């Protein structure tokens, strides 16, 4: 429990919506778990009308990858800011204690890197996000956030202490975007990141997003990119929102056990239709599929989901169960 | 527990704010409970300035009627869409499992009907709402939603398992409306439902409602239409909001026991001043009146309540209790 | 427990962010606790650009002072409205039962005073606010609200019934302000309170605040006015928001035990990153500092905090703990 004397392990991160391989309950003692992330500023196409965002990311994606450790472990992150970027960046882990979540110890200009270590002494899903002095909201709404999941060493439990397991974990980052429009009513397109700043701050101040998207763009988690599962399988759905409130809902399903405030030492609530993720936090829900078909997983402000983008799909294979639901009479002429 | 072999019972629905007669705790075994609803598109006057809404409803009201069953029962709904309507409709029960809550099995064009059955295996208050492919938010904000209440077979309980009862139940549906204005600054009035569409979607995208009303219009639950009760009586207040968050509060009273996320297998919280109903959900509060007089029951964003409409009244008869509250000195000149 | 036969004690109130001296657990039996407050309408400078607010306050401050009693006690408030004010006022205690929280018994015109007594029979942090018939939202968003804290007679407890203590309590009132602008794009400045009314109601109806501030102005709880503490000290952070939702977060810290709905007979949640205060309520969090340095305490809609004002600082003295957090490698050139 002096970290300098514990065993170290290096973890290879994977892009959302997947989550790197990890153990739930573990017999291992505490470890220093080492991760590396490289910041990439890049222009991204965020809708099907050609709208672009002068975006800023951890590891090339929105959200950044999910990092998974166990309660008692130490997180050790090397943060790299290449010389091909234009702005300075840093990282604030909501799961850490002190120095503005680590931000004060990780201020890196383009061409620099830094390494931070902190004790992950609290279980739960926590946001991590960039927070450079003087430009915090701009870096966060441009894409710089992701989740740290700290699992209890004994794995997740229900309100009575019974063991809960998941077969697969998915991570969904929800981003309220503020794209400026010009006097012709079209969204603006900037040559550089610094040029989008002033216009973007004015839109931010109205508190009305132009778009609200899951994982970087409208329909990101649809079509070939839909989430997948099978009847009988239990999924863990991690949902982060670093700037604004959201209310997740699984259409045709439920939140079997949900930690909406995302902290695993608290008992979960069961049978939720819709849950609430406070801006500045990550929460987690378990669901075991009982019916096959296409589900929608969305923010249940329905204008925010269908008009502004905050909706994805989960394609589930398996056998239909008529005891749970059955069409008694299909659509047909009204008896006259 | 094969539904095809259980006894069937037909229930006659009643308009909000009342709730059809039903048992709380019951000794009956599971049943297939049959209900019928007819969709009615209609223009409604929603304020005291003559503003109209091209509205869409279940059974002629906003919200639609509350359907009440017990955990373990099956809900069997016949959904009718008359030929006098212009749009196609369907129904998504958040209390059901599979096929987009039943929406995929109930798509009815004008002149058609369908019958769906599902197992009500989770206790709580759940939203049901229309959700036609391509126009989901418009149908919901135009009035198509209501609540399904699934009671535990043993009735409601407190955190310690003690029995809780209500003498009367009221259902309140809260609707964020997006009425378009023309270039003269007045709200528009349309000859048909289809003509209001495009203008309405543009207002919806601003995320700013023009009006927010309880049960179909400003002041719906006031005057001759105020809710009523007596000192000593315990009321159940069901509150649904299918699209946007709300925060109910009883002025002069409290939420004695509240399930804000609306799911009865979870323990309730006590003594709440103000609770929170996530958009896309229904929640429930119990209160036993201890003082007579006129109470206000409202959304405690006070601009939303007093300026935009989200407020009602409860008139309570009985005896004033000076031990709970007493005027020591009435308003009078300040001692000089 | 007839209040007319209990001992009376008078309490001297202190300005926010401090809270008057009081006992947590007490051996005393119930008391009638007497307080006095004087309303002061005044113009206030609310930002660093000279913007003014035609404000309305309890006791000269935003928020008004926090009143602290114990469960079972009676609150007896004398409310004074001097003749130098222009409007009528009253008080609604969310902690009281009946007569619109006391508002119906305390309507005082300029030149009048009144005295109300009520039983504080429910533990928790509760909002109190002004609510004059016909102008409720305007008086509340102009500054008339504060908190009543009713402590359990045995002091605060955790979910298992273990005793929890605080060494110091701070009270933070968060105010969504709606300052009108004129046709030249500058904020308006009014000669009198009544002149600001009509313009202000039009801004309120957009539901978009111009500014969101802690304790009366942008940066109120910064610089010489930062909150203070030491490593090892446990602080109680009371947060009220009488009109609009907010989501408090301590940067570099956590909510060790939090009652977000603010009612102490309910078990608290632990390890929160960010909590939620519903508009129309007050909530409370405990935190024991483990690291020295400057923390930010803010609403984690980051545009609301950094662009609109809802952020303060806590300066903490003590010794840095490298086991909780350590810079392994400071910012330096990337290895080529
Ligand atoms: Cu950054
Ligand atoms: Cu943060
Ligand atoms: Cu419809
Ligand atoms: Cu829905
Ligand atoms: Cu007032
Ligand atoms: Cu109030
Ligand atoms: Zn080592
Ligand atoms: Zn580990
Ligand atoms: Zn499994
Ligand atoms: Zn049958
Ligand atoms: Zn039944
Ligand atoms: Zn009763
Ligand atoms: Zn006395
Ligand atoms: Zn006392
Ligand atoms: Zn202490």
Residue B224 sits at the vertex; the CA angle it makes with B220 and B227, to the nearest 5 degrees, is 65
C-beta separation of A24 from A156 below 8 A = yes
| Tokens standing for residue C106 | 């305390």
Query: DSSP state, B303?
Result: I
Q: What is the largest CA-CA distance in chain C?
A: 82
Ligand nearest to the CA of B142: 3
> In angstroms, what separates the C-alpha of C252 from chain B's closest C-alpha?
28
List CB contacts of C183: < 8 A, sequence separation 6 or more. none
CATH topology (fold) of A2-152: Immunoglobulin-like (2.60.40)
State the DSSP H helix or E strand holding residue C204, giving kind and residue range, or none if neither. Answer: helix C197-205
Q: Do A117 and C269 touch (CB under 8 A)?
A: no
Q: Which ligand is nearest to the CA of B7?
A: 10
Q: Are A89 and A77 in contact (CB under 8 A)?
A: no
Q: Which of A3, A99, A280 sits opposite C293 (nearest CB)?
A: A99
Per-residue DSSP letter, B322: T
Q: What is the CA radius of gyration of chain B?
A: 21
The three-state DSSP-derived secondary structure of C78-89 is EEEECCCCCCCE
Nearest to C283, CA basis, from C173, C166, C209, C175? C173
Phi, psi of C78 (to 5 degrees): -95, 120
Q: Any idea which ligand is nearest the CA of B134?
A: 3
By CB atoms closer than 10 A (0-12, 13-18, 19+), residue C325 is buried
Task: Calculate the CA dihedral of residues C3, C6, C8, C14 and round it to 10 degrees.
Answer: -70
- The DSSP H or E segment spanning B197 is helix B197-205
Nearest to B311 by CA among B301, B324, B296: B296
Please provide residue C139's backbone torsions phi and psi, each rounded to the nearest 5 degrees.
-65, -35
Chain A residues with CB-CB distance to C208 below 8 A: 206-208
Q: What chains are in contact with C, requiring at least 3 Cβ pairs below 8 Å?
A: A, B
Closest CA to B215 of B311, B319, B317: B311
Instruction: Compute φ and ψ for C109, nearest 5 degrees.
Output: -85, 165
Same fold, B2-152 and B153-319: yes
- Structure tokens that stand for A77 in this block: 């992150």
- Chain A nearest-CA residue for C291: A98
Q: Is A271 close to B123, i.e. CB distance below 8 A?
A: yes
Q: Given 2.60.40.420, 1.20.1560.10, 2.60.120.260, 3.90.580.10, which CATH number is that of A153-319?
A: 2.60.40.420
Is-contact A11 A35, C-beta < 8 A? yes
- A82 φ, ψ (degrees, to nearest 5): -55, 160
Give the separation between CA C145 and CA C58, rounded to whole angstroms: 7
Strand pairing report for A234-241 and A281-288: antiparallel
- Whether residue B256 contacts residue B236, with contact meaning beta carbons closer than 8 Å, is answered with no
DSSP for B174-185, please give it. EEEE---B-TTS
Could you count the other beta carbons within 10 Å of the beta carbon of residue C49? Answer: 9
Among candidates A249, A320, A329 on the partner chain, residue whose Cβ is nearest the Cβ of B280: A249
- Give CA–CA dist B256/B240, Å, rounded: 19
Pick the residue from chain B with its C-alpha nearest to C138: B303
CA gap C56, C39 in Å, rounded: 8
Enumerate the domain spans of chain A: 2-152, 153-319
Q: Which among B135, B43, B126 has a CA at the least distance from the CA of B90? A: B135
SS (HEC) of chain A: CCHHHCCEEECCCCCCCCCCCCCCCCCCCCCEEEEEEEEEEEEEECCCCCCEEEEEEECCECCCCCEEEECCCEEEEEEEECCCCCCCECCEECCCCCHHHHHHHCCECCCEEEEEEEECCCCEEEEEECCCCCCHHHHHHCCCEEEEEEECCCCCECCCCCECCCCEEEEEEEEEECCCECCCCCECCCCCCHHHHHHHHHHHHCCCCCEEEECCCCCCCCHHHCEEEECCCEEEEEEEECCCCECEEECCCCEEEEECCCCCCCCCEEEECECCECCCEEEEEEEECCCCEEEEEEECCHHHHHHCCCEEEEEEECCCCCCCEEEEEEEEECCC
CB C117 within 8 A of CB C74: yes
Q: Are B138 and B242 in contact (CB under 8 A)?
A: no
Instruction: Point out the residue among C208, C271, C274 whose CB comes nearest to the CB of A207.
Output: C208
Task: Give the separation between CA B282 and CA B127, rounded to whole angstroms.
Answer: 6
C41 vs C110: CA distance, rounded Å:
11
3-state SS assignment for residue C147: strand
Query: What chains are in contact with B, requiring at least 3 Cβ pairs below 8 Å?
Result: A, C
In 3-state terms, what secondary structure has residue B104? helix
CB atoms within 10 A of CB A15: 15
Q: How far is the CA of A95 from the centre of ligand 8 (A)?
A: 15
Cα–Cα dist C186/C179, whole Å: 10
What's the CA gap between B179 and B208, in Å, rounded?
10
**Degrees to nearest 5, angle at CA A281 with B204 and A253:** 65
Q: Find chain C residues with C-beta within 8 A of B272's C-beta.
A: 261, 263
Cα of B23 from ligand 11 centre, angstroms: 8
Nearest CA of chain B to the CA of C323: how many Å?
38
Cβ of C279 within 8 Å of Cβ of B327? The answer is no
Longest dimension (CA), chain A: 82
- The whole-angstrom separation of Cα B105 and Cα B98 is 10
C-alpha A28 – ligand 8 centre gap (Å):
7
Nearest-10 Cα torsion for B227, B228, B232, B235: -30
The beta strands (E) that lie in chain B are given as 8-10, 32-45, 52-58, 67-70, 74-81, 92-93, 112-119, 124-129, 145-151, 168-177, 211-214, 227-230, 234-241, 248-250, 255-259, 269-272, 281-288, 293-299, 311-317, 325-333
- B332: chain C residues, CB-CB within 8 Å: 112-114
Closest residue, chain C, to A34 (C-alpha): C328
Q: What is the resolution of this structure in A?
A: 1.9
Q: Which residue of B has its CA nearest to C90?
A: B331
> In the Cβ-directed half-sphere of B256, how many Cα atoms lie within 13 Å?
16
């Amino acid at each position: 429990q002096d970290a300098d004397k514990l065993p170290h392990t290096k973890v290879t991160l994977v892009a959302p919506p997947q989550v790197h391989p990890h153990e739930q309950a573990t017999k291992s003692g505490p470890k220093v778990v080492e991760f590396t992330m490289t910041i990439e500023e890049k222009k991204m196409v965020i809708d099907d009308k050609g709208t672009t965002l002068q975006a800023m990311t951890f590891n090339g994606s929105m959200p950044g990858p999910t990092l998974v450790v166990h309660e008692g472990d130490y997180v050790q992150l090397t943060l790299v800011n290449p010389a091909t970027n234009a702005m300075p960046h840093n990282v604030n882990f909501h799961g850490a204690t002190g120095a503005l979540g680590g931000a004060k110890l990780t201020n890196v200009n383009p061409g620099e890197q830094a390494t931070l270590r902190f004790k992950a002494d609290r279980s739960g899903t926590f946001v991590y996000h960039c927070a450079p002095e003087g430009m915090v909201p701009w870096h966060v709404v441009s894409g710089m956030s992701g989740t740290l999941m700290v699992l209890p060493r004994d794995g997740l439990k229900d309100p009575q202490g019974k063991p809960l397991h998941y077969d697969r974990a998915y991570t969904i980052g929800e981003f309220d975007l503020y794209i400026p429009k010009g006097p012709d009513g079209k969204y603006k397109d900037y040559a550089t990141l610094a040029e989008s700043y002033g216009d973007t701050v004015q839109v931010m101040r109205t508190l009305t997003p132009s778009h609200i998207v899951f994982n970087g763009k409208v329909g990101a988690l649809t079509g070939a990119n839909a989430l997948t599962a099978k009847v009988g399988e239990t999924v863990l759905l991690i949902h982060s929102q670093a700037n604004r409130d959201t209310r997740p809902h699984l259409i045709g399903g439920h939140g079997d056990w949900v930690w909406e405030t995302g902290k695993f030492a608290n008992p979960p609530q069961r049978d939720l239709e819709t849950w609430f993720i406070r801006g500045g936090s990550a929460g987690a829900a378990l669901y075991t599929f009982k019916q096959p078909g296409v589900y929608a997983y969305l923010n249940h402000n329905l204008i925010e989901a269908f008009e502004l983008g905050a909706a994805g799909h989960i394609k589930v294979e398996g056998k239909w169960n008529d005891d749970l639901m059955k069409q008694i009479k299909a659509p047909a002429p009204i008896p006259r």
